[PDB]
């Protein structure tokens, strides 16, 4: 589904992303915005047989398995289809694992280019969460 900005903020806060390994809630909301526009159904094909899935565009080459990607590593040990659910549980758990690597949120190019080092709290500011 397509989340409302505030609706996603509340959901992400509920799912423990606010202050997860130091990253404030706005960071994840902003990343969600630029990656898929709060759309859990968003998918994107890449030059390799890999595909990005969900509200946070998680790659099938490293993080999830769709049974049709060469060199799949399935780091999150999860079916990519689980990342398309209107239920963000799986996408969040996987994100938390990605950000647990030495590079943290730098895994998301869009976050680096349009969120990293900005007033990301602007993204949850206004919402009555």
């Amino acid at each position, epitope marked *: 589904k397509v989340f409302g900005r505030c609706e996603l903020a509340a959901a992400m806060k509920r799912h*423990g992303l606010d202050n997860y*390994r130091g990253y404030s809630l706005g960071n994840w909301v902003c990343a969600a915005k630029f990656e898929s526009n709060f759309n859990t159904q968003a998918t994107n094909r890449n030059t390799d047989g890999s595909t990005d899935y969900g509200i946070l565009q998680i790659n099938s080459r490293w993080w999830c398995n769709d049974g049709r990607t060469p060199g799949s590593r399935n780091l999150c*040990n999860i079916p990519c289809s689980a990342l398309l659910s209107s239920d963000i549980t799986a996408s969040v758990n996987c994100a938390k694992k990605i950000v*647990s690597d030495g*590079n943290g949120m730098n895994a998301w190019v869009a976050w680096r280019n349009r969120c990293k080092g900005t007033d990301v709290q602007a993204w949850i500011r206004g919402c009555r969460l």
Partner: antibody
Amino acid sequence: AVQLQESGPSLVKPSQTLSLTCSVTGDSVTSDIWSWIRKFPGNKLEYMGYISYSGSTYYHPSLKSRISITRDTSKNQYYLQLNSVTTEDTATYYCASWGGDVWGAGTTVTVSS
Amino acid sequence: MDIVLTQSPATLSVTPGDSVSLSCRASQSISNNLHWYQQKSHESPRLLIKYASQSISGIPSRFSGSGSGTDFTLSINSVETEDFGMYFCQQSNSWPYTFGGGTKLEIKR
């Protein structure tokens, strides 16, 4: 099904180095984040640190300077190195996946002279 | 500073068939990043609940968790014969990850 198994000297002398090995079977060491957890007497658990799928590491600050975690991609194992041990390092050592879904049987390491 | 997790009571004696609630409290808010482990004697820890209340496929349904922030609870509806032993909570919200002191589930007689 992925399985883990710890191995190493069960006895280490004070001031010397503690070394353990965790053999990954069923999958690749590159297919997950792996960690070392120790249990001191009195049921006191300590998360020593972990090594990512990329080889990146995070160490418990209390152990920073004494600890080192590495892996070997061709043998599918990762290791723990703990220097300048003292009797206080005596404990049961376990290797586990980051997700906590898999654990080795654990192996006791005793520091004594 | 390192997050401290306090579990209570230290020990709990119960009769199989009874329900019990185990408490874990954090010195700081950790949202839903609290996990529950069971460790029986001579066995390594087994993950029962992840992220405060998510169930693990393969774990008996009598096990469930709740709470958020700094107050969490592990519930066991009708404790069973093979459920006795140590129960520990662990947070993964901040590094270093930390474990609580654990609660011992013992048999009442």
